[PDB]
Amino acid sequence: QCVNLTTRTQLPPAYTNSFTRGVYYPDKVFRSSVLHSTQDLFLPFFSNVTWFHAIHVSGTNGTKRFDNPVLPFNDGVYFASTEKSNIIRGWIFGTTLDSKTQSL
Amino acid sequence: ASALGKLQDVVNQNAQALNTLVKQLSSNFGAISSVLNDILSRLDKVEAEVQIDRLITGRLQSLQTYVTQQLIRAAEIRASANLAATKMSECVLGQSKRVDFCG
Amino acid sequence: TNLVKNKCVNFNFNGLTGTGVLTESNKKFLPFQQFGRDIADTTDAVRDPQTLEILDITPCSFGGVSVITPGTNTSNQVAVLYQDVNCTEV
Amino acid sequence: SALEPLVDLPIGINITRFQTLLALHRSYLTPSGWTAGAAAYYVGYLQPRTFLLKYNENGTITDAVDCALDPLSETKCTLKSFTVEKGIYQTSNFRVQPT
């Protein structure tokens, strides 16, 4: 297979501000109405967060823009989407994005 | 709710140091772990002896810190208690001629 | 090993080890969780892996023995006070 | 938004890069078909930070506060409280650093 349509598009990544976001439970331990403090990997509040578009119609007629880049993992990764109609399934996570390493 | 702060401060500071005193149990103090059994589980005793020292020396010290605080803090209360017992005797039981001792 | 309820037991759950009095408890865990904990970073409440249930951990009671006596002058008789227990473990 | 861990898996690999996946289809003769609907998502990178976590009576975390967010946020991590009483509080010291 490996059918491919790069359809590269210009313009700056549209950013946004995660206000209160990306707070998970970093333990199984059940706690009730207490203030617990840990230093762990998170997405810090008021952060810079890129609203990317995998497919983007900018109207004249059609013009679907397939932009989704290979993206570095860096320290850790957060993800968010709406997608009333699912078009998103999973992620390719890896290193070489090829053989010679494992692939998630 | 701030009128009672004097009392509220006493109760807090007591419960404060206790929390601190407890949390000192979970500190390594240079030992390989804060669980007294893990040092015994992982390591053969002859070395684990030196490890448990750093726990004991750490914890045993950490008591004297707590104890000394209580002694000092009690000595304050001991002073405040006499102030009450003085007021209770002079102010309540008698009538005080001491200006602004009773307020 | 068969679980012990309302009786001082050494225990291990999922590798978590301690010694306490395991009881039925109504505190309510979210599915993925394992432990509960208290303010002091003790292990307060655990969930039985095989049959999901919320089990408290209260380590077995203990307290200062207090020997109440008149002067040994007047008598050799003492009345012992076990502090802060239910009267069973005597 | 509180996120529970789904599965904790033995992965043992370092992942330095990635891309998402898509679901597209085929169409038939109209003036091949691709790019079903529209697609957009959000991405941000993690980072070590100290959060104070407020559980609820049912353990549902609502309020979380970063300590390093601003000089104001670092003091709330000293009192451990989301309520900060009127007054002056001493946040962590600062140092001038060498050029």
Ligand SMILES: *[C@@H]1O[C@H](CO)[C@@H](O)[C@H](O)[C@H]1NC(C)=O
């Ligand atoms: C303690 O034990 C006595 C029986 O010796 C019983 O009557 C009492 O209700 C118990 N109290 C508690 C705290 O369970």
